[PDB]
């Protein structure tokens, strides 16, 4: 475990904060909602035309959203290399630049890489807003007028709960706090030991690895609440009273929320799965150094 070899954990949100871009495919949670709406349209004959939208408008968007990330892939490799010299003290010695000047480039390169993923999909952002609005216009095709049946909407919730049951939320909840406790235990130790040791290169390499680790935990913690918000609300609707027939315009709002809430759960599960693997990996790096720190002070 010399250095980190995966940097798929970075993400960025727009200023309006409605859209979160992840490096993991589909890169957008709304595509998962679009994929999940296709399940809705299969049961209703009136929305059978939606398959053309999915075959063309949404499928091209996934390929187009993925391509915009590829332009940032080259800038990603530039940033990725900067971490390796910063995190490894023996590699940092060859560079022989100040720790702060090497840190300043990283911070500017961190936003620049963050900025590329955000800026390249800006034209794509208007598309996802255009697709789901088109689906709102398509939902006027249902042959109901204040008598829309809620069966299909409710048969999906009992199936979703089973899909909800597969993911173990409680194991993830234990993972973060214990790791975050070790994160705390590392940092508060460093603030008092930095005065004790005179060489900073080895402890600065940790201090960087710790600072980046703190960034990774927030992405895990943020997604966990949204997955927790997705399990709670969908489960609460199953607890709530179920009417067979609702308004046409209201059924549109019914369909959107479950797919909206479910898409975040699907999206969070992918990021949560990757984030812990990067979290335990950074924990593996912080510890191979801790052994290197103690041995040198002995002699």
């Amino acid at each position, epitope marked *: 475990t010399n250095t980190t070899d995966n940097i798929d954990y970075f993400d960025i949100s727009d200023e309006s904060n409605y859209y979160l871009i992840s490096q993991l495919r589909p890169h957008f949670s709304n595509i998962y909602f679009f994929d999940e709406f296709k399940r809705y349209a299969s049961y209703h004959t009136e929305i059978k035309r939606y398959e053309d939208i999915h075959k063309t*408008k949404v499928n091209s968007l996934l390929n187009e959203a993925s391509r915009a990330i590829g332009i940032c892939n080259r800038a990603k490799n530039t940033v990725k290399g900067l971490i390796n010299i910063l995190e490894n003290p023996q590699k940092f010695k060859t560079q022989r630049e100040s720790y702060d000047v090497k840190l300043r480039q990283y911070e500017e390169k961190k936003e620049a890489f963050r900025g590329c993923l955000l800026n390249k999909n800006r034209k794509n952002l208007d598309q996802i807003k255009k697709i789901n609005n*088109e689906i709102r216009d398509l939902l006027e095709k249902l042959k109901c007028s204040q008598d829309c049946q809620t069966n299909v909407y409710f048969d999906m919730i009992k199936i979703y709960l089973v899909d909800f049951k597969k993911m173990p939320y409680e194991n993830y909840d234990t993972f973060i706090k214990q790791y975050k406790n070790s994160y705390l235990s590392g940092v508060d130790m460093i603030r008092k030991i930095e005065k004790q040791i005179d060489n900073p290169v080895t402890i600065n390499a940790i201090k960087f690895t710790q600072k980046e680790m703190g960034y990774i935990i927030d992405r895990f913690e943020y997604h966990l609440q949204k997955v927790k918000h997705s399990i709670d609300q969908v489960t609460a609707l199953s607890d709530g009273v179920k009417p067979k027939q609702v308004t046409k315009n209201r059924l549109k709002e019914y369909y959107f929320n479950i797919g909206n809430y479910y898409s975040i759960f699907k999206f969070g599960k992918d990021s949560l799965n990757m984030l812990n693997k990067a979290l335990i990996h950074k924990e593996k790096i912080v510890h191979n150094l801790l052994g290197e720190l103690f041995g040198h002070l002995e002699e």
Partner: antibody
Amino acid sequence: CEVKLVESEGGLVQPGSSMNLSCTASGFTFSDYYMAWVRQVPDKGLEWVASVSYDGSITYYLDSLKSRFIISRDNVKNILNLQMSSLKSEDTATYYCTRVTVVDSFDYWGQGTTLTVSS
Amino acid sequence: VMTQSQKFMSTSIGVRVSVTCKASQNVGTNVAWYQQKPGQSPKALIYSASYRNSGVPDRFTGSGSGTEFTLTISNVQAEYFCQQYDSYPYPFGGGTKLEIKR
């Protein structure tokens, strides 16, 4: 700036086909909206002719007209194309180029082209 | 597949006027209304019975669900077509020309 649809003649043709129609779209993104044509007769507009998907892969033809009509669309040049074979005195028509919403309603209409088929 | 229309109607400026369209197998909200001038292209003002496009004067309204539909307009200055876009074929009503009393 303004959404509009232009059309080609039109005019007298012989029963043995020999007629093609084109349509120009401007002021909007061609790819997002479907493209349909509509047929017209003195007493009309009941009958409707084909429409073409965004990609251009799937198209629906009138059962009566499926054998003698082919539709195509040029997304690149913003052109909607109609192909007719073995024209008949029933095919005599005015044709209005239309934009088709997702709800299959025709939100915008072209100026129209008048076709006459006889001997 | 379903289609109806009715005979022409005669009204004068300026009163409210209904146009009657029925048909045979419930299309729900799936109806469209187009206005055709005597020598100009058809223009769509009403889709889904109760919804009107932009660029459509406020006097034009629509109503009805299921099998029967009507179009009422409060004021007046030609021929109007009701359509089902729900299922193939997508047929318009024969249309009712408008005349002015005198």
